[PDB]
Design a protein around this ligand. Sequence first.
Ligand SMILES: OC[C@H]1O[C@H](Oc2c[nH]c3ccc(Br)c(Cl)c23)[C@@H](O)[C@@H](O)[C@@H]1O
Ligand SMILES: OC[C@H]1O[C@H](Oc2c[nH]c3ccc(Br)c(Cl)c23)[C@@H](O)[C@@H](O)[C@@H]1O
Ligand SMILES: OC[C@H]1O[C@H](Oc2c[nH]c3ccc(Br)c(Cl)c23)[C@@H](O)[C@@H](O)[C@@H]1O
Ligand SMILES: OC[C@H]1O[C@H](Oc2c[nH]c3ccc(Br)c(Cl)c23)[C@@H](O)[C@@H](O)[C@@H]1O
Ligand SMILES: OC[C@H]1O[C@H](Oc2c[nH]c3ccc(Br)c(Cl)c23)[C@@H](O)[C@@H](O)[C@@H]1O
Ligand SMILES: OC[C@H]1O[C@H](Oc2c[nH]c3ccc(Br)c(Cl)c23)[C@@H](O)[C@@H](O)[C@@H]1O
Lengths: 442, 442
Amino acid sequence: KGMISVGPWGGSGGNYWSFKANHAITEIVIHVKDNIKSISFKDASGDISGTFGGKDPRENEKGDEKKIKIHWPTEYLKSISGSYGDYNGVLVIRSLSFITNLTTYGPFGSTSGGESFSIPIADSVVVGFHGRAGYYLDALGIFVQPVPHGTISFGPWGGPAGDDAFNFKVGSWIKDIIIYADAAINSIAFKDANGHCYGKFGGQDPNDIGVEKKVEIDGNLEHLKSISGTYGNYKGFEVVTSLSFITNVTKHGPFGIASGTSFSIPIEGSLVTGFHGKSGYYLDSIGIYVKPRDVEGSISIGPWGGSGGDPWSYTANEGINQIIIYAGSNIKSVAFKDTSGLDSATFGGVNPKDTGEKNTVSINWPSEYLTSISGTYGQYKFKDVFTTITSLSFTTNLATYGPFGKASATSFSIPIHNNMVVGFHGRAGDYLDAIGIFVKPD
Amino acid sequence: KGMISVGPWGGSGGNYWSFKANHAITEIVIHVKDNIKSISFKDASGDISGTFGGKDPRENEKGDEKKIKIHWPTEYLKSISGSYGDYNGVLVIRSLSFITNLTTYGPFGSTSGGESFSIPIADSVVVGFHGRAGYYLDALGIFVQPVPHGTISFGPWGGPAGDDAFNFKVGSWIKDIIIYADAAINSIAFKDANGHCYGKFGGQDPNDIGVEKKVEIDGNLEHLKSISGTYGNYKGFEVVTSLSFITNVTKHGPFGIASGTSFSIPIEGSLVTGFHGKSGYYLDSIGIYVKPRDVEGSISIGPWGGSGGDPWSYTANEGINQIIIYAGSNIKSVAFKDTSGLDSATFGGVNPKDTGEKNTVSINWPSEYLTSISGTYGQYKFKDVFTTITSLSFTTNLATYGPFGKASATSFSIPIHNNMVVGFHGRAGDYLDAIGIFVKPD
Ligand SMILES: OC[C@H]1O[C@H](Oc2c[nH]c3ccc(Br)c(Cl)c23)[C@@H](O)[C@@H](O)[C@@H]1O
Ligand SMILES: OC[C@H]1O[C@H](Oc2c[nH]c3ccc(Br)c(Cl)c23)[C@@H](O)[C@@H](O)[C@@H]1O
Ligand SMILES: OC[C@H]1O[C@H](Oc2c[nH]c3ccc(Br)c(Cl)c23)[C@@H](O)[C@@H](O)[C@@H]1O
Ligand SMILES: OC[C@H]1O[C@H](Oc2c[nH]c3ccc(Br)c(Cl)c23)[C@@H](O)[C@@H](O)[C@@H]1O
Ligand SMILES: OC[C@H]1O[C@H](Oc2c[nH]c3ccc(Br)c(Cl)c23)[C@@H](O)[C@@H](O)[C@@H]1O
Ligand SMILES: OC[C@H]1O[C@H](Oc2c[nH]c3ccc(Br)c(Cl)c23)[C@@H](O)[C@@H](O)[C@@H]1O
């Protein structure tokens, strides 16, 4: 269920409305003359939304009807564009286009006397609409979810160059942003909630590195929702000149100096889970990956095992697909891949002289899906003595995998049903001290 | 979130629509002349639904606007009534009333040349609408949830007499219906999924007991959703003459003979969790309690303990409030009460010579709410030896209660977070062999 809200664009009059389709959106009905008088929708199984707007009593204000058909299932709605501006003294949607994987329908309505809006988005499917309406359509936005196996992406914003591409996604959340900036963004780097570090992207100029600044996000109160900033000329290059980091709680920034063309993205319900773009001497361009926060919550069970190691966690963006376990007489490390390409770091295995042997559990998701873990923990001795997970099995709705490592005296399991494992968490250092799961009903 | 759907009433033309309010419904706007051209809604924070219907191009067909205001928060919508019939050759909603805890608004529209509908409902709050619409409002129904601490109730249907009132609600599900019938319903009785028996309601006539019939519902495929039947004259008395039991899978019945006035209730998303009415020699009247099935699911953890005892389970209708535990050196029995008055049977304690001592855990719900259990199980000897829960504690978001009984060698717990316990299950006989929990995220 969870979706990201984009926009809306237009004026602030009218009453809030939303429509979340129960099946793919296959028709958009609008009433148009100079502006958008009204809008409604229809889904693949004939369900309709109400009509939003169109409340002008004046008859010469009804507007002409246009039906946009989406040739489902080979064509699907992915985005919109259009324009807002004044109409009879009200800030209102004036024109609209509907962007599909195959073509664009529109523009509909007047394309003058406006201010246009568009969305630098990828891997999205529009699963609903929202906006403001009164007599007319004051404002319009969309509800998006990722495409199967994908991740919603916005941007990148900035210049066109940068010899070094970068691109990563996290399985926890962004906790630290380290920026060197002055008037421009010289470089950027990020830390996981697990402490894993991404990049330095940029900062290759020996005679110009900029001034450091750090943003530290407390996961108990705050989470990265979005970014904004500015890009334009720096010493002859087109690069990012300022950035702000937007959370549910506040705006951190701006860093660098605001010059050139400013950018932002009006999203709600989003957790930034990564970044992509290009860099070189400086940060040429940057974009975000974003995931819907759920309405659901996840239950956390465990962890079981020793009480050393640094805390770590991994939640699938989609479905956990693959588990890599290094084992010998205990468990050295654990790693996860998911159906959307989200690959965890390796948790454990920090000691090159004790790495164990690689094992792979491959899960055909979603027909097969993880269901719980069981195993043992206890003493393990290399040079020193440790308390770690020593043996470990994984259960799915279809089968059991392992055991891996060696059984020891203290065993654990979870008599659990009607659930699926959506993620893992625990503690690791040289080995896998402790491990637990995140679950959801089904 | 889960709500019960009632209706809709009217014709089968138009397109399906629904509106689920995010805040209490405070306004209904209708366009009316002879029939209902169109409808829309507004909630406590200004959110609007779209307009449903009103698509006649003919301007002499727009209809007059009427605004029904709900004086929230002291007044709330509870039900509707109205009528459907023909209009320009289409089966359509013609009149409507809106029933509140304080008054009825309407009727609006024509009250002639229809067929009226009404709803014998109790303890409901309307949290949304659905229906069919095209040019006009072809059909309308409601979405309901129970009032705080209540249970939605329909009926009772039948005659006005019956010296013996009956009334019960189950914390699992209805598995067996035992009816004795010839031409009318002489008596009715029901079994829980736990095997607990309710009544015999009726059957007091020594010279007329009727013929037995049983309905056995398999919880793996099927669940009681609803009832229908007939009532009217039997040997001078006004009583229930036939009944059918409607599940998701089929209609079981009719039992007795269909004579007099027939009744039914068009509901979806419901689980029948009890019955109420009055009886004597025969079944004079019968009504149902229902609960919304969830969209959510519950995760089941455990049970822990011995492997004897009959399976039992209890799921709060609202919030678990009170736990009654009889203990001595092991656990004899367990029972539960919730904030809506749903009281479980006693699980365990079947032996009058070994009952232990009563204990009470009182939870102030919802500020305080159950979070998990822990304890021990092992041997306990009275005359024979048994393996049961021997000690038991309960954890809430605020505190821990117990231990009750006596610790023994095998202990259990659940390292769990971000959840609430919405119910219990296990096995019991003379004592509490085993116990587990149902959980949900939060
Ligand atoms: O859809 C645009 C407007 O619709 C309603 O506005 C009007 C109400 N009475 C009017 C008379 C005239 C003109 Br022009 C307008 Cl917009 C209105 C109200 O809902 C306004 O908030 C909203 O901005
Ligand atoms: O980040 C700004 C620019 O940095 C790099 O370009 C260079 C900038 N100053 C230099 C000096 C030397 C050499 Br060699 C190179 Cl590539 C550069 C390259 O990454 C460019 O594509 C990028 O646009
Ligand atoms: O992987 C498990 C261990 O790895 C890291 O610790 C150690 C590294 N080299 C060592 C040598 C000895 C002893 Br003793 C310990 Cl804990 C360590 C630390 O993270 C420990 O907390 C953790 O338990
Ligand atoms: O809501 C009533 C009707 O609206 C639409 O109907 C009509 C379409 N073209 C027409 C011409 C005339 C008359 Br009369 C009617 Cl109802 C229609 C369609 O959606 C019908 O399914 C629906 O029953
Ligand atoms: O069949 C339902 C009827 O059964 C009871 O009434 C009696 C029916 N036949 C009788 C014979 C005797 C005595 Br005494 C009584 Cl109460 C009755 C009473 O419970 C009536 O209120 C009820 O309507
Ligand atoms: O308290 C739980 C026990 O009570 C019931 O059994 C017994 C009743 N009287 C007995 C005497 C002896 C032995 Br041994 C047993 Cl299991 C019983 C049955 O429910 C058993 O399955 C259950 O383990």
